[PDB]
Each structure stands twice: as structure tokens, then as C-alpha cells.
Symmetry: C2
Subunit: 749 residues, 2 copies
């Protein structure tokens, strides 16, 4: 829950995906952040010569062989996003990488393929590097049609529109640029476009791929750059600024919609200000002290947040000698508080370098993870404060070792600053959420079931190997529920059972399974039997209880005695009646049609045929219920009801033979079936699949195991029917395994 | 003035500028629009071959020798925007052109060098050309630092931040791209930034320049490019689209602020919508029926505008044979009304071609001019409707002749639609404001003065020759007023007096002025002169009337009046009462001080020292009214005042000799001062410029003529002080004369 006063300006971060340096996933990114490790990979001369960088530049001492690079520039799943191999070859690598990162952000949001009723805008940015321009334009142009298609597909300008076209997003799709605050500017436009209500979801956040991956950079004195290959923000050894690669996408909702839909929310963006320096600085690349102070004050006033209550600031933190004290003094002036050493500082550019179009979304994703985990990270590469940082009389301390959030700064509020080269300064105030009530004291909960699904079996193997650090990071219950309801399903399926001690047990396939057969559920004669089509196991399911309330409301005005009209009392008086057994079987079959929506046949022998017919809709419920009352006591003058047709996707059976619109008008075989009361099991051959549980069901999760084994077959099980009236909070499941085909870079000088 | 409902959603287009094909200014653009002029030019083989296009590419029959191009992409005034010459050479030729167009839009809004208290955002978007990438990266990378600076100045994506740096705009500055709708998406999020309160002004715009200017293009079957160099939207012989260069910037403001600040408003964007096609089309480069229909419906809903009240729709109108019936059908099914042919269809791409990424602001500027001029333009190259177009069962007709905006369509609402290749569809609903009243009642009353100013006399001559089409189009009085209050002043100045027949007479300069002399206002003796400090001519000023009312409100508490008060009949006893001559002089002097900010001396011949000290603050105003009443009766002893401190500046003199802090404290100087002198040049020689008006003054525009000659003689004039309580309306004055320097394109 949020637990602060809700103005209208509240945007929730409901799912984030990264491809930062050494940070392929969000958990690897958080691991690098809380471990405080630099993600720059210093290379070797053989690696530079392999990537096409010549010894006449390797011998140059102002060429630092270091780059915070991204693995997987050339890998792309073309067919998943609707591309041909020729189209994916002509695509920019930024287009391919942000295709995958944006899909992973929708997946982490829980909206991977349920973007139909939601308007989703794509607000992404992209840096431009001249290296891709040299490679792509230096190739032979050929014809004019190919050149027009190459200018459409292979430029970063149409990045957002390609992402929207592949992911079928029909909101405000903009491709922004403000050159270092590009992705907090994109997040600001996303927040404003959501608060206006143009879109209901918003993908925000940029990408930089410096085409030559595994290369170095030319440090130079007139530039600002890291002279040694490390970025040291707010540090006495601040060498300069290290330009990494990166890609980050956040998915954003209004907090009212995100709380109503049960979305996991990392943090909420309370307010966001954007200004520009204009001429109020030294030059075009200079920082502006007053512009940064004004944007922090405007965002704090925006968020109705006093900077007393801010416990972390993700600074822009470029690691330069002169820009860091301007940023610190602007933060000190905007925090006109006279409270000393309470807010932490941070810079993600210590870890992943400057990212230049994903720098703002790097800071936003890092700050949302900081508020989500309530853990102040360490600021990497920091030992001594910069000599002109007046750190002692300031609001801000710098964390050297990871710590949890201070108790006297609650609710956790934090600020994300990204200040552009170009002058565009963005500040965002973010508030953390109160953590979820885990009512377990690490007691024995249940074996949970994680339904992995991939379009091919090797990707399913990638998923199953992905599940092990995922269970190392999260809890099994929310990961299981999120893979149940928030992930789209595909052909190749696999369920993993996870116990209290973490052991990933693959559920076995179903036996006696034949392909291309209808799915049926048969209920025996309820006069002799006791199981009311497994209704003692659906008694928790908050849908059986819903249909029990429905039959209670229908019965009140129908039947006299109290013991038949109280809900949730039917467990003890189950064997004491037949009307109770029929009502239990009605609600059980309704839940067994909600689950397994492709369960097509309904079957029933003896007096369970009236539950089968009333659930299927072939007979109305009224005459079934009071008819079942006289089968409870009278068994004389049965009244055969009206011939209704069932629910048109569904179909009835008697013992496996479908009694469907060929005999249904007859009074003969209905009364012959009902008055017989035989219960005899159904025949061996019906060429269909029976929903028949194993007889070792004693623990209320073996039924969930069985419907998981059903899901591992062709059934598209709707798992939300199963769960009780406290539904599980969602959280983050697996990321998609992409069928990584390889497209090389056409490199030419 | 607006005549609709203020929901708080309205954004006023208060200033526009273009650089379109054959459209250097806004008026050339509107002339090309109303004449239906196709602004595409066709080249000969010698012109293209000498321009730098290969002979094989010329004699290819799949080459079309036509391009709607911008004149002057290599010209730029670098020193105006803070650029050195190499630094402006490293600017791409979209940065230079859009600095000029953006300054012209901000100047047309009247906020050139007035964006101090206003937070101004820049929301522009360029479309990158592969050919200037070939130029700029065909240059040798001699240094790494030069490559970094040439990557942050050479790339179009820093376009908005370069504009905001050069113009000192400190609001939300974004560079955007949504394709054929880049500049309407820019206008859209500019509108949302204004409506949210992020910025008070917003420069929204876009630009394409495909850098071989004057060069043809390649067409074939798989491209949408036109077969014959003609863009013919909604036409039977629609060949295909025709891509040209273009630039255009609108300046936007919230409508309540634009009405409060008295801005000229072209049109009012009532509501805007942006969606995307998504995957719901055939391909990525295809148009989408449902996206366009949904965005037109959403924009009409958010604007609270019924689609039967829309009298003109500026379409995308790309000129293709397939996309034109798709766009017409989406407009038809978004216009759910059953009325037939009440709305005109427009397409600026008939005129200027598909100016990519400036097409949205081309259509928006055209639509805002249509609503401003209340004129429905022809659709150019239109002869016959397309065979898939059902104009008969539709809300739309295609005008062939320039029609007036019909009655029973007030207030004039219009929609503008730009539909990107990329899927982003923007639709906007614009409402025209109202016509200007023109309350001269077709009579001759006043020559009016147009203060041109420029930093050099070549620029000032160019600005002077701007006035023949500007007076051919605009009203002279509002042209003069918005030159007076809404243009920045520079050093080289020239006033052009325009009489009521429109003939331009340059206003002759002051033939006797002294350059370093401080300016002073001498007022003579009050006992002998029936005339005050030109107060009979300054009576019509609003500032003078305000000061007279406040002064009389001070006066009547302890004046023991003879009831000659209330400051509206002071001309009645301006021959007799020394009291109201003195008070009238005080109010006038003070008006002269507020009208000319560089006024210093206040010399007086005797009893004019009381109004002089009343303005300069050395004696309090109540004290000089009381003492001057005592001088009116004069039977008692003379009074020595409290002798307060002087105001900074505004120093006192007696005959031109600035006397302060030597005998300003004691008594007898005041005695020999309040005894009269009756001498005009009492100083002899002191090298002081005076505000002695010409001796022949009849028409009351002669005093404004003298103030204009003072302005042309090197001092600032607060021109708004002069005018009455109905102030004139601002309008469009004059495009700035940029000192063009040629920056050639690099080879290959």
C-alpha cells in the first residue's frame, strides 16, 4: 500500500526491464547496484584487434581500452516481433535490443499480451552514434525502394514506432531526445500523458548502443571523459565520465489504476519537473547550477514532498571534477533544510557508466529498485569526498556500504536527477511503497506450481534454467502466481513444483492421454457417492463460494429448511442429504468450467446428471434444485423440465455418450436415466479425455497439482478460479527466452 | 473575442513563422495557399548537373526532376544567436534554418527579447537526412574533441536545445520524432505542457531539409513517390506523394494568458489527440483506417466540438492513390453526422509537397491562417475526385476556388490531421478567434509611425523595404503599434511615418542634437504661460489620466477647492488657475518622464520648480500642491518646504545647470528661484539636449511625431505610455533582417 496522501499526480512504476552492462536482468542490475561494483570491462589488445580497432589507435596512450558494454547486440528474435530475417538484418541494433527490453518490461508489468483494453504509449529515446551511420550508409545502396525501406527500418528515429507496431501498442508513440536526460524526459512525458489520460500504460526509457561493442574510447583533456576507465562520482579521484551502453524500459500506470488492478509497484513517481538552463550557465556543455536547483525545487514542490522526507537522491553523477560540486551545491540549495547528513547520495554511473539515453531510466530503475528493496546501496568507486564538496554541513551523506532504509525517513521518498548536455534538467521525486504482508513465518505453506511455457522446447529449457536464480531472489508463491496469471502461454509447457525447501521438481506428464479429444468431466450418482465432483477441494476457491452464494440466494426464496440454505456449512452435512450434494456438485462443476475453459463435455450418471445438465445450461437450475428436493425425500411424481439448449460452447453426456439434440426432447430416456440410480462407472472407450483425479488427493494442493498437469497438456487453465479470497500479490515472474538468431554488423571504414 | 466556452483546455497560436517552398514569410505562404500555387519547381538537366547530380542519374528515366525546396539553407546569421563562424559551419543546415524560423515565430508572437518572466518550452523535431550524414561524416576526423563537438552540434537531435540555448528559453525542451506527424505531435505535447503549467510559452515546430537542395528524386512502383513531380491529393490523376523541404514554428500559449496579455491570436487549439495505428494495418509503412478515425473522434471529443460545427479539415492528403480514399473514409466515418458537404477539405501538400516532419506544422499553420483570414483556400492540382471517393455521401467538398468562410459556421472551427508513416496519428481541433473590429469607421484621422530598428544600416534598409508588402497586407495602425511595443530595439533606427492613404514617408531626424548630452525637460514660468509642459497634447494619454486622477485624489482632502477638480475639466481653467496649471504640469511632466525613460533634467523658469521637484521627489507632491496653493493666494509669507531627498536619477536643474547638494538645503536659493526669469535658453551653453517640441503643433499626432524623432535619435521610448485607454491591438509587424552569411555545404 502507498500510505501517504494521494493527490492526482501519482504514477506507478509497474514493471522495469534493463539491458545495462553486466546487468542482463533486473536482478543482475540490482545485484551490481547493491554490491557496488563497476560494470566496465577492461579489454585486451587481441579483443580490440578482433573487434576491428587498429594498433595505430591501441598504441595511443589516450585510448582507454574500457567500455561498459552490452552482451547481445547482434541477437534478435525476428519472428517473435513480426520481422523477416531481411527486415531484422536491416534493423538498427538499438531497435532490436529495445524491442526485447520493451517486451521484457511489459512482461514484468504483467501485461505481456493483455494489451487490448489498455492504451499503451511508447515514449522511448535513443542516442545516435556515427558508427552505425558509417556502417549502414557505407553499404551499397542498390535501388531506391531498398533505400527508402532501409531509412524507415534502420534508423533510430523510428524506434518507438517499430516497438509499438510489433507490440501492438496504440497510444501516444513518441521518439524523444534530450541527450542525457532523454529517458527521464521520456518518463516525464509518459507521466504527463498518463495523468492527462491519453494512455493507460506507458513504456518509457531509452537506449544507447555504440555500434563498436568491445571497443575503447579516446580520452582527451578538452573533452570530459574518464582518463583511466572508471567513473568516480563525488570522489576525490574523479577522473571524468565513462560512456557505457544500456537500455532500460519502465512501464508506468496511474497509481489508482495500478492499485485497482493489483499490479506490483516498485515505486511511484510523485512529481516530475523538466526545465532547461538556457543561457544561465557558462557554455552549451556546461551544467547550470540555478537550472538544476530550480528543477529540484519544482519537482519537490510538484510532488508536495518536503525535502526533509527524502532519504536518497540518485544524482546525475557524471564523475567529472567540476560538475559534481555544482550538482551537490544545487542539491544543497534546493534542500534548504538545515538538517545535516540524512539523505543518501547515489550515482548509477559509478556502476554502469554514463549511458546517454538510458542514463535517466538507469537512475529511475535503480531508484525504484532502491525503494522496492528499501536498501540504500553503496556509491561505487568512492573513498574520499571531492575536496570542494561541503559534505558536512549538507543534507547528504554518501553511503560506502549497503544499508537498509533509515527508520526515521519513512515513507521512503527519493529523488532521481538527470541533467542533460543540452541543458534539459529532469528531476523526479519517487516514493517507495509499504511492503507486502507476508503472513507466513516460514511455516510449511504448500508446494506451489510454476507454469513455464515457451513456443519451443529449447526456450523452455532456458526458462527452466532461468527459474533457479529467480527462486534464489524471490519467494515461490508470488512467482508461481505471476507465472500462472500474468504470463502468456505458448505451445511447449512445463510445470515446476517448488516445496518449502527450494527444490524444483518437474511435474510429470499426464497418462492415458490421447491427442485431439474433447475434455469431459463425469459425475456419478450422488445417491451413493460422497465426493460432489471434488467440491471439498474447491471449498476454498472464492468462486465455488461465489456460486454457493448464488445458489443460496436462489434457494432462499425456493426452499424451507435452514440447513440447506446456509452457505459454507455443507461440509459437515454433506452425507446427510442429496440436495446438498447436488448444490455442491453444481458449484463444483461451475468452478470446473471456469477452470479449463476448454473443458467441453459434461457427463453424469444417475442423479448427478441433473447437476451436469443444470451446470451446462441444458436444463434450468430452478426445476433441477426443487426436483432434487423430491429426489431427496419423495421419489414420486417427477416433473421433467423444459428442454433448454446448453451454453453453446459446451455439451452434455450421459455416460460418455453425448445426449445432444438427437434425443433431448424425449421424456423417456431422461426418466429412465434418473429413476434408475445406478452410478455405474462410465465405459472404457469414449475417445475423449476425462478429468479424473488421482485417488491420493488428501491435501487440497494435489488438486492444484492435477490441474497443473492438465495445464501442461493442451488445456489453457484459468488459474484465477483456484485461489481463495485473499488473492496472492503478483510480483515478478520469468523473463521471456528469445530465440536469438544472429545478425552481424556490416563494418566498414 | 473568442465566443466559446473556457473549459481551461484551450491553447492559443499567438505567433507563427514558416520557411516553406516559395514561402519565405507567412504572407508568401498564405498567398501561395489562396492562389492554390503549386510550389514545386522543375529543373533542367544543366541546373541539376551543375548542382552536383550525376549525368547517369539525370538521364535515368526513373528520375523526376522536381523538388519543392527551401530558398537559403546555407544562409545564417551566426552572430545573432551566439555562434562563431566555424561553430555555425558545424551546425547542420536544419539548426541554422530553425534558429531563424524559431526566432521569427517568437518575434511574431511579440516575445522576442521578452521571455524573461515567461517559461518557454521548445518542442521541435527534425527528420534526419542520409545525405547530410554523408556530407558531415565524409569530412576527416582530424581530432577526437572536434568529433565530440561536431557530434553535439552537427546532429539534428540537439536542435531544440540549440534553439533554446540561443534564445534563452528555460522550459521543457524536447526533440521529437513521429514521422509525417512530428510537428503536430510536437504541437500536441507543447499544448499538454502548457495546459499542465510546465511552460507559459511553447515553440512547437519541425523541419526537413534534404540537403542536395535543387535536386530531383527517384520514383518507381513500390515507392509512394510521385511519377510526375506533382502532388495531387484526393485527385483522379493522383500519382503519388512529393517530398519537399520545409520548416515552420508556432508559438503557443494558454488562451487565458493570451487574452490577458493582449496577444494576437491566429487560432485556438481547443483539443488535440494522438494515437498510433499499432499493428492494426497491413504493414508498418501503410496507413490505418481505425487509427485515423479514432484520433479524429478523440480530438473532437476532447475539444468538446461536434463534428457538424467543423467548417474546414486540413487533411494529411499525401497524394497517393491508395491512402487518399483511406484518409477520406476515416474522416467520413469519424464525422458521424449525416449532413452533406458542409466542411471543406484541405491539403497543404498539394502546394508545398510532403514536407516531412514539418508537414504537421505546415497543416497547422495553414489551418490557423485559414481561421485567421476566414478564407477557405482551393486544393491545388484538383480537377476531378478519385474514383474511390464518395464526395456525394460525405460531409466534405473539395474547393476549387478560394471561398469565404461561410456563415452559419460561426465560430470557425477547423480540424488538422497529420498521419505519420510509423503509425502516429495526430488530429487537432482549431477554432478561429473573431475578426478585428476596425473601429476607424472608414475615416482619416492620423498618420502613424513605424519604428524600424536593426543592428546595422544594411539590415535597417532591408527592414525598411519589408514595409511595402507588409502595408499591402496589414493594417497600418496595428503594424505601427506592434512595432512600437512588441519589437526589440537596436542601435540603427528609422521611423517611417505612414499617412492614411498608406504612403510611406521616412521621418526626418533631429537636426540639432548632442550625443553625450543628457536629456532634459524644461518647463517655463507658470504665472505667465497659459501652456503647461505640452499637457494639452498629453491629455489623451492613459498614463496622464491615471496620474491626474491619483493626484486629484491626493488633492481634494486639503485643497479647500473652488470645486475645479476631478481632473477631467482642467482645460477649462487652464487660463486662470495657477493651482491647476501647476497640478496639470506635475501630471504632464511625470508622464513625459515615464514616456522617455532617459529623461534627466527638469529645469524651470520659476514656479516650474514645484512640478519639477514633484516628479523628481525632492519635495513631496502634497507639499508642492499646498505651497503652490499658497502661491496662488500669495498674501502670506513664502513657505520653505520639508526638503526631502531626491529620487535616483531624474536630477534637478534651474536653467540647465544641475544644482544639487550645494544650495539644495538652505533657503534663499528657493527665493531667487521662485522669483521668475522668463528666459528659455537660460543656461547659455551647457551641452544639454532638451525636449523643446517644434513650434508648430496642431494635429496632436505631431507630438507623437516628435517622440518618434526622439526615438530615432537614439533614446528608448515607452510607446505604451502615449496611447489612450483603448489600447491598439498587436499584430504581425516585421520579420527580423538576419545578416546572412553563406556557409557552404561540404562536398560529396
Amino acid at each position: 500500500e502507498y500510505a501517504s496522501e494521494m493527490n492526482g499526480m501519482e504514477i506507478a512504476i509497474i514493471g522495469m526491464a534493463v539491458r545495462f552492462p553486466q546487468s542482463r536482468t533486473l536482478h543482475e542490475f540490482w545485484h551490481n547496484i547493491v554490491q557496488g561494483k563497476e560494470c566496465v570491462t577492461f579489454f585486451s589488445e587481441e579483443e580490440l584487434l578482433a573487434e576491428g580497432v587498429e594498433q595505430s589507435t591501441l598504441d595511443n596512450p589516450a585510448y582507454v581500452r574500457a567500455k561498459p558494454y552490452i552482451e547481445g547486440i547482434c541477437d534478435f528474435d525476428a519472428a517473435f516481433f513480426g520481422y523477416s530475417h531481411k527486415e531484422a538484418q536491416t534493423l538498427d541494433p538499438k531497435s532490436r535490443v529495445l524491442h526485447e527490453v520493451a517486451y521484457h518490461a511489459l512482461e514484468d508489468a504483467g501485461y505481456a499480451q493483455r494489451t487490448s483494453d489498455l492504451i499503451t504509449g511508447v515514449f522511448v529515446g535513443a542516442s545516435e552514434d556515427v558508427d552505425w551511420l558509417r556502417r549502414s550508409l557505407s553499404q551499397i545502396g542498390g535501388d531506391a525502394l531498398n533505400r527508402f525501406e532501409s531509412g524507415i527500418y534502420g534508423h533510430k528515429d523510428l524506434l518507438a514506432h517499430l516497438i509499438a507496431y510489433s507490440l501492438n501498442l496504440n497510444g501516444p508513440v513518441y521518439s524523444l531526445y534530450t541527450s542525457c536526460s532523454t529517458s527521464l524526459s521520456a518518463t516525464h512525458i509518459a507521466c504527463r500523458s498518463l495523468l492527462f489520460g491519453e494512455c493507460d500504460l506507458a513504456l518509457a526509457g531509452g537506449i544507447t548502443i555504440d555500434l563498436p561493442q568491445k571497443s575503447g574510447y579516446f580520452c582527451q583533456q578538452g573533452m570530459i571523459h574518464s582518463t583511466d576507465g572508471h567513473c568516480r562520482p563525488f570522489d576525490s579521484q574523479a577522473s571524468g565520465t565513462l560512456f557505457g551502453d544500456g537500455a532500460g524500459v519502465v512501464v508506468l500506470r496511474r497509481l489508482e489504476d495500478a492499485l485497482a488492478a493489483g499490479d506490483r509497484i516498485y515505486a511511484v513517481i510523485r512529481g516530475s519537473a523538466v526545465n532547461n538552463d538556457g543561457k544561465q550557465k557558462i557554455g552549451f556543455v556546461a551544467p547550470g547550477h540555478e537550472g538544476q536547483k530550480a528543477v529540484i525545487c519544482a519537482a519537490c514542490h510538484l510532488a508536495e514532498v518536503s525535502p526533509e522526507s527524502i532519504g536518497y537522491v540518485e544524482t546525475h553523477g557524471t564523475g567529472t571534477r567540476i560538475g559534481d560540486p555544482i550538482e551537490f551545491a544545487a542539491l544543497t540549495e534546493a534542500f534548504d533544510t538545515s538538517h545535516r547528513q540524512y539523505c543518501a547520495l547515489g550515482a548509477v554511473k559509478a556502476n554502469i557508466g554514463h549511458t546517454h539515453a538510458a542514463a535517466g531510466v538507469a537512475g529511475l530503475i535503480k531508484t525504484a529498485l532502491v525503494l522496492h528493496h528499501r536498501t540504500i546501496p553503496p556509491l561505487a568507486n568512492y573513498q574520499m569526498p571531492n575536496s570542494k564538496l561541503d559534505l558536512a554541513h549538507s543534507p547528504f551523506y554518501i553511503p560506502i556500504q549497503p544499508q537498509e532504509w533509515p527508520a526515521s525517513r519513512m515513507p521512503p521518498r527519493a529523488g532521481v536527477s538527470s541533467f542533460g548536455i543540452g541543458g534539459t534538467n529532469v528531476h523526479m521525486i519517487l516514493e517507495g511503497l509499504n511492503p507486502a504482508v507476508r503472513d507466513d513465518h516460514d511455516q510449511v505453506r504448500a508446494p506451489v506450481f510454476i507454469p513455464l511455457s515457451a513456443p519451443s522446447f529449447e526456450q523452455l529449457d532456458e526458462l527452466t534454467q532461468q527459474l533457479t536464480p529467480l527462486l534464489a531472489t524471490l519467494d515461490a508463491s508470488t512467482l508461481a502466481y505471476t507465472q500462472q496469471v500474468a504470463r502468456p502461454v505458448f505451445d511447449c509447457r512445463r510445470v515446476i513444483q517448488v516445496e518449502n525447501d527450494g527444490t524444483q521438481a518437474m511435474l510429470a506428464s499426464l497418462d492415458n492421454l490421447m491427442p485431439d479429444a474433447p475434455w469431459g468431466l463425469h459425475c456419478p450418482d450422488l445417491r451413493t457417492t460422497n465426493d460432489c465432483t471434488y467440491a471439498q477441494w474447491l471449498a476454498h476457491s472464492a468462486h465455488y463460494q461465489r456460486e454457493a452464494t448464488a445458489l443460496t440466494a436462489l434457494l432462499d426464496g425456493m426452499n424451507i429448511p435452514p440447513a440447506y440454505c446456509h452457505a459454507e456449512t455443507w461440509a459437515a452435512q454433506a452425507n446427510s442429504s442429496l440436495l446438498i450434494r447436488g448444490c455442491q456438485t453444481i458449484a463444483a462443476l461451475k468452478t470446473w468450467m471456469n477452470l479449463l475453459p476448454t473443458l467441453t463435455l459434461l457427463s453424469g450418471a444417475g442423479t448427478g446428471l441433473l447437476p451436469a445438465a443444470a451446470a451446462s445450461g441444458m436444463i434450468a437450475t430452478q426445476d433441477v434444485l426443487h426436483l432434487l428436493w423430491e429426489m431427496e425425500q419423495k421419489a414420486l411424481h417427477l416433473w421433467l423440465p423444459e428442454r433448454h439448449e446448453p451454453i453453446p460452447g459446451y455439451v452434455l453426456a450421459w455416460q460418455g455418450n453425448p445426449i445432444t439434440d438427437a434425443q433431448r426432447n424425449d421424456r423417456g430416456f431422461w426418466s429412465e436415466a434418473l429413476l434408475a440410480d445406478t452410478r455405474e462407472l462410465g465405459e472404457g472407450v469414449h475417445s475423449i479425455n476425462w478429468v479424473r483425479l488421482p485417488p491420493e488427493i488428501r491435501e487440497d494442493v494435489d488438486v492444484l497439482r492435477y490441474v497443473a498437469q492438465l495445464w501442461c497438456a493442451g488445456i489453457n487453465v484459468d488459474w484465477a478460479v483456484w485461489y481463495g479470497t485473499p488473492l496472492p500479490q503478483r510480483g515478478s515472474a520469468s523473463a521471456y527466452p528469445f530465440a536469438h538468431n544472429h545478425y552481424p554488423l556490416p563494418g566498414r571504414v
